[PDB]
Amino acid sequence: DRICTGITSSNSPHVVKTATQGEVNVTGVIPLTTTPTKSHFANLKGTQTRGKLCPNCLNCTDLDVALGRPKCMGTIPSAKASILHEVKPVTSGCFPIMHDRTKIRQLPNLLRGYENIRLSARNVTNAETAPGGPYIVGTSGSCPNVTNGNGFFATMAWAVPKNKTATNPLTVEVPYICTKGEDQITVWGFHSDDETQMVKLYGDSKPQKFTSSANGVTTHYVSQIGGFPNQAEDEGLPQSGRIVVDYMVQKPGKTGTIAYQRGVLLPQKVWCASGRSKVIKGSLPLIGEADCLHEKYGGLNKSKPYYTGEHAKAIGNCPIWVKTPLKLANGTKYRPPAKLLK
Amino acid sequence: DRICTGITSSNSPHVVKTATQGEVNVTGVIPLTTTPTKSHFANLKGTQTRGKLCPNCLNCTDLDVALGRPKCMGTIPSAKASILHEVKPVTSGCFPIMHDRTKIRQLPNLLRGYENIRLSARNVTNAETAPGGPYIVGTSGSCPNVTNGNGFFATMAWAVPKNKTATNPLTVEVPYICTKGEDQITVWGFHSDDETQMVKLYGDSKPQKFTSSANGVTTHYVSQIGGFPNQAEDEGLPQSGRIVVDYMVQKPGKTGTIAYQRGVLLPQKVWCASGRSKVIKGSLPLIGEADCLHEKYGGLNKSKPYYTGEHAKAIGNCPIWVKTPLKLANGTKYRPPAKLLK
Amino acid sequence: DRICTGITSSNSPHVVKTATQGEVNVTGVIPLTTTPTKSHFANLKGTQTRGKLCPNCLNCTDLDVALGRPKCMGTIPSAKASILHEVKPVTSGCFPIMHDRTKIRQLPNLLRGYENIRLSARNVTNAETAPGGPYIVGTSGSCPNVTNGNGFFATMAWAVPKNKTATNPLTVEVPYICTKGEDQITVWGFHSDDETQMVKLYGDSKPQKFTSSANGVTTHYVSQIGGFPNQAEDEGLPQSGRIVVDYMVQKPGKTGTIAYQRGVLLPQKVWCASGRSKVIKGSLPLIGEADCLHEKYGGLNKSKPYYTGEHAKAIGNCPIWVKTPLKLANGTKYRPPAKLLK
Amino acid sequence: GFFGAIAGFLEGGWEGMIAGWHGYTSHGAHGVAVAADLKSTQEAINKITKNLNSLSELEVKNLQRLSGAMDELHNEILELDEKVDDLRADTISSQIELAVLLSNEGIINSEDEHLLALERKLKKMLGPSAVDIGNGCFETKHKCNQTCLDRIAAGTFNAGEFSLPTFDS
Amino acid sequence: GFFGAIAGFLEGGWEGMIAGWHGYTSHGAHGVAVAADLKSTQEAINKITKNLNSLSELEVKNLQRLSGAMDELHNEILELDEKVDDLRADTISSQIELAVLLSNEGIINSEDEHLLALERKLKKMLGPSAVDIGNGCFETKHKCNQTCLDRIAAGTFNAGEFSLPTFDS
Amino acid sequence: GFFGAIAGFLEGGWEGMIAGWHGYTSHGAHGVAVAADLKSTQEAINKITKNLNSLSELEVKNLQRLSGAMDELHNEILELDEKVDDLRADTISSQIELAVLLSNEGIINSEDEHLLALERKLKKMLGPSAVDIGNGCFETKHKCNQTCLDRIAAGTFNAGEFSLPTFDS
Ligand SMILES: *[C@@H]1O[C@H](CO)[C@@H](O[C@@H]2O[C@H](CO)[C@@H](O)[C@H](O)[C@H]2NC(C)=O)[C@H](O)[C@H]1NC(C)=O
Ligand SMILES: *[C@@H]1O[C@H](CO)[C@@H](O[C@@H]2O[C@H](CO)[C@@H](O)[C@H](O)[C@H]2NC(C)=O)[C@H](O)[C@H]1NC(C)=O
Ligand SMILES: *[C@@H]1O[C@H](CO)[C@@H](O[C@@H]2O[C@H](CO)[C@@H](O)[C@H](O)[C@H]2NC(C)=O)[C@H](O)[C@H]1NC(C)=O
Ligand SMILES: *[C@@H]1O[C@H](CO)[C@@H](O[C@@H]2O[C@H](CO)[C@@H](O)[C@H](O)[C@H]2NC(C)=O)[C@H](O)[C@H]1NC(C)=O
Ligand SMILES: *[C@@H]1O[C@H](CO)[C@@H](O[C@@H]2O[C@H](CO)[C@@H](O)[C@H](O)[C@H]2NC(C)=O)[C@H](O)[C@H]1NC(C)=O
Ligand SMILES: *[C@@H]1O[C@H](CO)[C@@H](O[C@@H]2O[C@H](CO)[C@@H](O)[C@H](O)[C@H]2NC(C)=O)[C@H](O)[C@H]1NC(C)=O
Ligand SMILES: *[C@@H]1O[C@H](CO)[C@@H](O[C@H]2O[C@H](CO)[C@@H](O)[C@H](O)[C@H]2NC(C)=O)[C@H](O)[C@H]1NC(C)=O
Ligand SMILES: *[C@@H]1O[C@H](CO)[C@@H](O[C@H]2O[C@H](CO)[C@@H](O)[C@H](O)[C@H]2NC(C)=O)[C@H](O)[C@H]1NC(C)=O
Ligand SMILES: *[C@@H]1O[C@H](CO)[C@@H](O[C@H]2O[C@H](CO)[C@@H](O)[C@H](O)[C@H]2NC(C)=O)[C@H](O)[C@H]1NC(C)=O
Ligand SMILES: *[C@@H]1O[C@H](CO)[C@@H](O[C@H]2O[C@H](CO)[C@@H](O)[C@H](O)[C@H]2NC(C)=O)[C@H](O)[C@H]1NC(C)=O
Ligand SMILES: *[C@@H]1O[C@H](CO)[C@@H](O[C@H]2O[C@H](CO)[C@@H](O)[C@H](O)[C@H]2NC(C)=O)[C@H](O)[C@H]1NC(C)=O
Ligand SMILES: *[C@@H]1O[C@H](CO)[C@@H](O[C@H]2O[C@H](CO)[C@@H](O)[C@H](O)[C@H]2NC(C)=O)[C@H](O)[C@H]1NC(C)=O
Ligand SMILES: *[C@@H]1O[C@H](CO)[C@@H](O)[C@H](O)[C@H]1NC(C)=O
Ligand SMILES: *[C@@H]1O[C@H](CO)[C@@H](O)[C@H](O)[C@H]1NC(C)=O
Ligand SMILES: *[C@@H]1O[C@H](CO)[C@@H](O)[C@H](O)[C@H]1NC(C)=O
Ligand SMILES: *[C@@H]1O[C@H](CO)[C@@H](O)[C@H](O)[C@H]1NC(C)=O
Numbered sequence A, B, C: 001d002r003i004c005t006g007i008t009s010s011n012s013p014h015v016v017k018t019a020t021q022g023e024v025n026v027t028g029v030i031p032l033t034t035t036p037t038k039s040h041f042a043n044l045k046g047t048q049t050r051g052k053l054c055p056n057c058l059n060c061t062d063l064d065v066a067l068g069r070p071k072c073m074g075t076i077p078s079a080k081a082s083i084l085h086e087v088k089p090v091t092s093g094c095f096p097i098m099h100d101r102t103k104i105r106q107l108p109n110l111l112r113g114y115e116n117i118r119l120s121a122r123n124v125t126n127a128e129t130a131p132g133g134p135y136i137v138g139t140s141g142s143c144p145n146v147t148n149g150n151g152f153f154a155t156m157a158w159a160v161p162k163n164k165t166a167t168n169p170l171t172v173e174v175p176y177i178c179t180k181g182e183d184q185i186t187v188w189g190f191h192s193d194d195e196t197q198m199v200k201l202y203g204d205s206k207p208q209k210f211t212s213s214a215n216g217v218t219t220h221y222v223s224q225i226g227g228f229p230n231q232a233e234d235e236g237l238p239q240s241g242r243i244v245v246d247y248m249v250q251k252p253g254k255t256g257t258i259a260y261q262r263g264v265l266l267p268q269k270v271w272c273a274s275g276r277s278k279v280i281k282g283s284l285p286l287i288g289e290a291d292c293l294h295e296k297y298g299g300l301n302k303s304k305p306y307y308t309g310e311h312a313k314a315i316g317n318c319p320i321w322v323k324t325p326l327k328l329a330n331g332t333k334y335r336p337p338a339k340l341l342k
Numbered sequence D, E, F: 001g002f003f004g005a006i007a008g009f010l011e012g013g014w015e016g017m018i019a020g021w022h023g024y025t026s027h028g029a030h031g032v033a034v035a036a037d038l039k040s041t042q043e044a045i046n047k048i049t050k051n052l053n054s055l056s057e058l059e060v061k062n063l064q065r066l067s068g069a070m071d072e073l074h075n076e077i078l079e080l081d082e083k084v085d086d087l088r089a090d091t092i093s094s095q096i097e098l099a100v101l102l103s104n105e106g107i108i109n110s111e112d113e114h115l116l117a118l119e120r121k122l123k124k125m126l127g128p129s130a131v132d133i134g135n136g137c138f139e140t141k142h143k144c145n146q147t148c149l150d151r152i153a154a155g156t157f158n159a160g161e162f163s164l165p166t167f168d169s
């Protein structure tokens, strides 16, 4: 009698990658792969997830909020994980801005970058005492104050001069003004209007030159007088003029320089920000809680160590992307059944 | 009698790297390495390879072509693999440009970036109807139209005013104008000339200010009046003046802003582009077909899995660069011949 | 009698990571890890290490030196390894500069980037022959020449005009001027002063416009007339005015363009630089020699193959950073002592 | 595998072997007997389990958007950022691909070392009267049908049940 | 290797072994006989072949110029791009370096497992009258010259050609 | 390990084994004898040594500041540069983590192959009168106390010191 060692033969439809034996069929396998499927986003587990930059600051754009629109002046919750729903964020009211002429639209998302952002304890520069003639803090219809009347972005002052006379460029110095080693985000721009209204609001009807410097970054603009594009992302018909608005970014202890003439929107309430919230691109009516947020697959929770599919930015507790569906052998190599004996 | 197992002893000049036994001598090896050798470039196998941005658009620079030089107005083939032969591309005729004053030279290579590029179905802005006085579409000798006479870059209009009077900066609005979600490349600049000719072509003899905005990117120029550098990369002697030319890049649905005075070269025929051709730096009189294109070794086809030598950008079906010549053991460890027996 | 093979049991407090058996206790281990400890920096072994950009050019800032301050005009040693001690380098004397209005402060560190840097064989542009009226090379108190009197940064010329009259923007052409394929760093700026002194030094009392172009990079400034910030990083009381200064970077064979009015500090002695010294951020009173320089741990020499702790830029012969303390088994798996026999 | 082909083992499956991966076959007048070993199949499943836990531990930094990028201003920087993400992903993927494959090679090959052990366990219990062929088989002085073999598989076998010499641990 | 030194094998080359890598030596009144085994040498060459095919499969994204870089405007971005290329290359190179070395360690070591198998193939065919030394050698009750050994190498050997007991598969 | 559990070896430490990692135990009327082998413990220490030298060789590009970055102007580029450094580090760290772990798995497992060899060295010197159990043990026709076993550990053992047959190399 002969007693021998043997191995099994059985259903071996699963194939595996080996170095020495090429690719082989195997009894069974533990898969390490999944393809996730597109779904709605969710609040990231061990954190808090940014929505409209300001919840509780209802019915407003992040851009609106950013710009310090009258009503939209609510308070910002800190988070360590932010989502970007607007690649091109919009304004939903207030004074007509010619958005597409400045990096401005991105301001909400720049802010989103940070863990902590705040409106401002104080305003940077004294609106009236500013270089140039004494200014009436221009107040504008079509930007309803809460009561009403003339509400103008806390962000900046509508610098209208008594003693209406043309100006040779002036320089305001926007200092640091932020607690801690916070990032300061300054904001500003210029109003310009039609021939007649120009002369009326400021004694001049001439294109106006504006130049800002901040940390070696310099920008120069020239105002427009007549024939402005249709107003959009606003309210109703002070079609008279438009605002060109920009942001300036100030690192801890750095100063800024705005040269200006007439139409100047001097900075006022100015963002202080600090810390780094992790940002991702997500289409967002946030629903529930997931382990992990995938730019594409969206809300997703961790089943297997890897996933296959479209690679993308993903934050949290995420499975690792992998080229191709991987499998771990949990069985033995296929062996054809034996009568190969005597 | 004793029968035993043994292994071979033989010529073992090849050495191999192991973890446990240090470095050991071996019977034979399969090498996985090659050093390639410098050679001419070639059309990349499973694709099509860009040459002068426009073949069939003969005897012209890519810059020429880019700028829309009269003759050089041929049609661009799409490709998915492009080569860069000019780090500093040249102009070979037409109107004297002071190249080194703008990012302009790179335009050909920006375009090369794309899978699809096209001259333009239409021109962006109505040359005569443009803000400022009615303009004669300036036509210039030394840029031979096909017949001849006055051919001026399809790219932009030589904006000469009837009613010759000095101007306070004006703003043209260059809209999107591109099919699909294509990239729009706008183009423009300004002419300026000597004291007398200035006053003659435009009622003024004053440095002229130009500012463009596009997607938060702002540029500001100041024209020159007398004493221009020798003309080069042109034809012959309207030495009177020179052109400073620039490009503007417009993402899908974005608008542009050019403020200008006199000398304005308003944009006309404007590039639409889309898709992403893979670009490499290659010196190019293209010859034949290779598996793979190496910035240095050039035309190269795949022999072994890795290569040793100079690392560089390489596209296609390329061997992987490797620190040092690698070898796979195809034999046994060296064993000194035996009489070590009794 | 039975003779058997066995393995040891002994003190096995060290634990190790395995694929097949999970984590196991082991006789002994060779550690591959260390946490280094913060210490002073040192001259990097197989190289030379930059200090104040100019040793032997004593008691001066790198910025001072960079700017070509009268005394601080010593000669620069080449090195292949540089250290950055000043994130915001300072000026320690000479004429009041409004630093925070230009990328200027970084100039020392830009220079530090290179293997070879030099002051200048010659000066770029003829100070007096420059476009505009003939200029007296302005010489300034409060920047003591070696003897004394009026020493002004070799970098640039204080362009004061005889025939004091307002100017329409002029264009100087700063050519290449550097040996080899060196990088040229041009330097320049503008002086501006109070209402009265302006009119006195130049027949005008008007904000002055300045624009430079270099390799498609454009910058535009507007001078200030009254109310300058307190002077700091200087000497004593020509509080009359201030200098706004900038740098321009010229790649091999490229030209530059400065448009200017009055106050112009035309470039003079101009940096040529070449080669690439490896740069790191290090707080530096350099002491001794180390194997390797760690942005944090500082001076450090190679004990074990890896280190654990804070990751950072490190140059030289450095241990590789590692997630967690790693250990190599130098013993056998723990085996509980045996009486498990019969 | 390479060991099994050379030292003339049998590349034979025994589709009879239901309850386990490796065990013993038994040959004679009874025909062929087959039995799984419920420790070799268990010990193999262990390694694999602990190997999974091994592959799972790996952590790789999140990989996310750039804090100060800005989606219309900084496209060229933003583009290099994608390159970075792509390369990172493609790199760490090839690494994992390696880790697993190595892991599989391990498991697949180790199978022969099970067989080899299982043989030595057998040699003990068959006593000194058996004859080690080298085949991975033993010529035994007694008959072994299904029942006998099942004791062999369980470790409750005793030679001398057919009065033959016995090693006693 | 470590196994061969400990269990007193022989770190001896047999430069006689032309047609193969591993096989048998044969000792006695005839002197020394040597023969390659043309399956152990073949089975070793296989692994290696399939190991090459293994190393070859690896794919790594192309690594090329930046689509919107621009060679005089964006140098700092363009510079970081080189860093990226360099690091990527240096990273993926060290990984491959590892893959191969591991691969070599595998092949080099596996050699001893050939020998070990080749022994067991031998044990079968020499019958139950041979004596397993542990040396990797067998004391045999009959003489074995070159011819006999060549049958041993081919698997066409039969004990009892010298009338001795035989295992029959 | 998996081999030791299956082929009923002994998961037993012999805390007697001071001078070495692996060696022999000896059983009988004398009680239990224990002796280290000073070549198996040495040959194991070798591998490890050469494995360290192996892990040490790895070189990875320095990773430093950007030559033309500029610390207030180019922050966004400078930021991506950190990303790059972080990823690189996190990548190359996971790779090393793998290299070592693999390395450990190697060393840890190889231990059983020492034992296995050490057995075969023993089988030789005990002569043809011993009986290979498969246990990793041998039933011997003579007594072996501490002294005898120490000769076994040293390779200066000779059967027939108790007049029994001997293999002579
Ligand atoms: C080994 O695995 C492969 C699949 O993993 C089996 O062959 C496959 O048969 C199915 C039948 O539906 C097909 O869908 C697959 O395309 C086939 N594989 C390929 C890619 O050729 C094979 O039968 C398995 N086992 C055996 C006994 O070889
Ligand atoms: C992933 O895991 C989480 C659990 O951590 C799931 O969250 C549940 O979501 C449902 C509806 O969205 C809620 O009612 C539960 O409160 C959540 N947790 C549980 C199970 O109590 C999440 O849905 C999972 N899957 C997906 C697709 O994200
Ligand atoms: C093992 O390999 C090395 C080379 O791979 C052999 O020694 C070399 O001898 C040649 C003779 O021309 C020299 O060019 C090499 O420089 C030597 N190697 C080094 C780096 O020392 C050696 O002879 C080979 N085989 C043996 C038997 O050791
Ligand atoms: C690499 O491979 C290709 C084949 O795919 C070679 O291309 C041949 O090139 C010659 C001359 O350049 C032509 O006559 C043939 O038509 C091409 N293919 C063949 C062989 O028919 C290429 O030359 C190879 N080597 C190099 C150096 O690139
Ligand atoms: C195996 O290793 C661990 C530590 O590496 C030992 O258990 C530890 O006991 C010490 C006593 O001071 C504690 O500090 C550790 O926290 C314990 N380890 C953990 C994390 O649980 C263990 O005793 C070692 N050997 C044995 C015999 O198991
Ligand atoms: C690292 O290694 C170097 C040796 O290469 C040590 O340098 C010594 O430093 C001391 C004082 O700093 C000097 O007196 C010696 O001249 C140096 N070399 C020797 C030993 O002769 C260095 O100190 C070591 N450790 C550290 C903390 O950097
Ligand atoms: C909203 O706007 C009005 C101005 O349009 C602000 O104050 C105005 O109304 C007050 C009535 O309580 C008057 O006392 C003020 O004189 C008047 N301002 C002017 C035009 O001089 C008012 O502060 C705003 N709402 C809030 C936040 O209270
Ligand atoms: C690996 O394979 C085995 C079968 O080959 C799996 O199943 C085993 O474990 C089960 C626990 O769910 C037990 O119920 C079974 O007794 C046992 N075998 C079977 C299927 O009868 C094991 O779970 C597989 N996967 C893993 C997690 O390793
Ligand atoms: C080339 O240039 C000329 C202008 O220099 C263009 O048209 C001119 O010649 C025509 C003769 O057929 C005349 O009918 C036009 O009036 C005249 N243009 C002027 C100066 O008014 C001509 O279109 C160009 N060549 C082409 C593409 O046909
Ligand atoms: C690996 O080594 C062997 C020799 O050690 C190579 O050669 C073998 O295969 C050849 C096919 O070209 C046969 O003709 C030979 O019979 C055989 N051995 C020799 C040289 O006589 C094998 O090709 C080597 N390389 C590879 C591809 O693995
Ligand atoms: C330092 O500055 C003075 C100018 O303030 C330079 O030359 C001055 O002094 C000289 C005395 O030797 C006179 O000959 C010069 O005329 C005078 N310059 C003027 C104001 O015209 C002097 O060159 C400088 N020091 C050095 C480097 O020699
Ligand atoms: C690995 O472990 C051994 C002990 O297990 C270390 O010690 C050995 O080598 C020493 C050289 O310093 C000798 O003096 C000892 O004889 C020997 N064993 C002991 C401790 O008695 C060995 O060095 C360890 N580390 C290394 C470098 O591998
Ligand atoms: C405004 O008017 C005042 C008084 O009428 C005049 O003196 C002054 O010049 C004007 N303001 C300025 C600063 O031009
Ligand atoms: C050009 O001339 C016309 C008529 O002679 C004149 O009315 C006009 O002011 C001038 N153009 C402009 C817009 O200045
Ligand atoms: C300076 O004065 C001269 C002579 O008094 C005069 O002719 C000239 O116009 C002035 N300079 C310039 C270029 O304006
Ligand atoms: C094996 O043989 C014995 C005879 O002694 C018998 O008792 C037993 O039932 C047999 N097993 C089977 C089921 O074949």
Ligand SMILES: *[C@@H]1O[C@H](CO)[C@@H](O)[C@H](O)[C@H]1NC(C)=O
Binding pocket: E145, E146, E147, E148
């Ligand atoms: C081996 O021995 C036999 C004697 O029986 C003989 O026939 C054969 O030729 C021998 N082989 C050689 C070539 O030594």
Ligand SMILES: *[C@@H]1O[C@H](CO)[C@@H](O)[C@H](O)[C@H]1NC(C)=O
Binding pocket: F145, F146, F147, F148
């Ligand atoms: C082993 O046995 C022999 C008896 O022949 C004796 O000489 C020797 O001392 C013994 N060893 C020990 C120390 O037990």
Ligand SMILES: *[C@H]1O[C@H](CO)[C@@H](O)[C@H](O)[C@H]1NC(C)=O
Binding pocket: A122, A123, A127, A137, A156, A157, A268, A269
């Ligand atoms: C800040 O300046 C604004 C003008 O923008 C002024 O109206 C306001 O009173 C100041 N601060 C407060 C208390 O909001």
Ligand SMILES: *[C@H]1O[C@H](CO)[C@@H](O)[C@H](O)[C@H]1NC(C)=O
Binding pocket: B122, B123, B127, B137, B156, B157, B268, B269
């Ligand atoms: C576009 O405008 C140009 C001026 O650049 C004009 O001459 C041309 O007719 C227009 N389009 C065509 C048909 O080329």
Ligand SMILES: *[C@H]1O[C@H](CO)[C@@H](O)[C@H](O)[C@H]1NC(C)=O
Binding pocket: C122, C123, C127, C137, C156, C157, C268, C269
């Ligand atoms: C370079 O020009 C300067 C003015 O900055 C002049 O004083 C000097 O003589 C020139 N070169 C020398 C010799 O320093």
